[PDB]
Design a protein around this ligand. Structure first.
Ligand SMILES: CN(c1ccccc1Cl)S(=O)(=O)[C@@H]1C[C@@H]2O[C@H]1C(c1ccc(O)cc1)=C2c1ccc(O)cc1
Ligand SMILES: CN(c1ccccc1Cl)S(=O)(=O)[C@@H]1C[C@@H]2O[C@H]1C(c1ccc(O)cc1)=C2c1ccc(O)cc1
Lengths: 223, 8, 239, 10
């Protein structure tokens, strides 16, 4: 149908995805309280980011709501992992909230997820994942979380390959790298799934107040 | 809905 | 280290030879459904498949190069995903149903009678239809299954040592080989270069859906407390 | 040992 994503060349797609990037936020100036408030504010930016992903607003509103409902924790996580790459062994929740692995210990179930997030960060850094590849992956997470949607995913795949080719990677290296990145998405799905379980548990235990948006987002998966 | 509204 | 020398065709041959059989159930279709009874059948079937899966794993190239701890970990991470991709594969030519065994089909009306199963049921169905529409081949299937085995547990832990980093990199090299092998199969099937990376992506994205279903499934498993000793152990790893 | 361990050790 009417679709900007299917009208863009690979360079325009990259440009548009780069332009759509949300900002990096600061932590407010208990650990669970800080992290929650930070995720809440990121979610608002994430919703407006998605509206700028070529193809997303061409979907029906019901589709759009469903993709954000399914993908939101995946997208927060890959964002966190991206900005932590320059800080091996640490999670850069924000420029004023840099947490070592071991600061994940205070909260029940969190440090196991921290280890998985750090493994992901180390993998991306070892692969020398580029900004342009990252924004492609993030849009694939959004669209794959839930026929036109598949045409767009094909297009973002083409765009990923293109970036690798322009970077001088051989065909073999492109196929291998494409696979390496997409297999990491399986792991990001895993972490999101486990986190969603812990979030619901935290709501029940009533020890930190999840925000309205977070509560509403959380209610999506237990449905 | 907070999402549905925000998307508009 | 020997497995890193295998050619594409040799990789396909090894994986096809190592394929587990499709197992049957003791299911008696001549009496009314019972939730407890069907769960027992599914548990028993799953338990028997796990034994086949463990011996299949030893035959996946590169797998036995890992220490016992890592072999154990990979199997613990991926067991339900591997059962599920098997189920969706053999369910392919059977729209509307999950073919647990040739003689045990679960239909959707009946799945509704299993408390909380219908959502996972529909996802499994969608995945199988996806594969059927893609005309997934046996050769591609066995590559995907091997990929799940090697990949699902490789990012659980941080590496604290160079040695640990190297064993991690050993797994990645084998995964790179199966990617090469997948592309090789697609090239030999007639697919243009664009088609090949598009098909490769589509298949790998489906692995994210399989992970998703496995996590949701695992949730329900450690909620009804059927389970065999081995299944309790595999489940314990996620709890 | 774990059961999984034993099934491999065969
Ligand atoms: C939900 N999790 C969790 C897991 C176990 C125990 C407790 C919790 Cl909160 S968890 O997955 O780690 C989750 C990942 C990471 O840390 C937890 C978390 C988080 C998210 C929401 C929230 O209300 C609190 C915390 C993270 C996060 C925050 C902002 C980002 O931009 C990115 C990530
Ligand atoms: C655990 N699940 C579940 C979900 C909701 C309600 C009840 C149940 Cl059993 S579930 O994920 O559907 C799960 C998938 C499918 O059916 C359940 C299940 C299963 C697995 C182990 C078991 O002890 C019982 C059932 C399945 C299975 C078995 C063998 C296979 O080769 C493949 C799959």
């Amino acid at each position: 149908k009417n679709s900007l994503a299917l009208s863009l060349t690979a360079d325009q797609m990259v440009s548009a995805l780069l332009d759509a990037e949300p900002p990096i936020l600061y932590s407010e100036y208990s650990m669970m309280g800080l992290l929650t408030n930070l995720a809440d504010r990121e979610l608002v930016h994430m919703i407006n980011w998605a509206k700028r992903v070529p193809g997303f607003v061409d979907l029906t509103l019901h589709d759009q709501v469903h993709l954000l409902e399914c993908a939101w924790l995946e997208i927060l996580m890959i964002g966190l992992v991206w900005r932590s790459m320059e800080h091996p062994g640490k999670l850069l929740f924000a420029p004023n909230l840099l947490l070592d692995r071991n600061q994940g210990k205070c909260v029940e179930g969190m440090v196991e997820i921290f280890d998985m997030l750090l493994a992901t960060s180390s993998r991306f850094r070892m692969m020398n994942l580029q900004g342009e590849e990252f924004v492609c992956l993030k849009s694939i997470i959004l669209l794959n979380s839930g026929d036109h949607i598949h045409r767009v995913l094909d297009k973002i795949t083409d765009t990923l390959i293109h970036l690798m080719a322009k970077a001088g990677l051989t065909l073999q290296q492109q196929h291998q790298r494409l696979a390496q990145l997409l297999l990491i998405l399986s792991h990001i799905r895993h972490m999101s799934n486990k986190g969603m379980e812990h979030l619901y548990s935290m709501k029940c235990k009533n020890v930190v107040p999840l925000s309205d948006l977070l509560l509403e987002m959380l209610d999506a998966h237990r449905l | 809905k907070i999402l549905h509204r925000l998307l508009q």
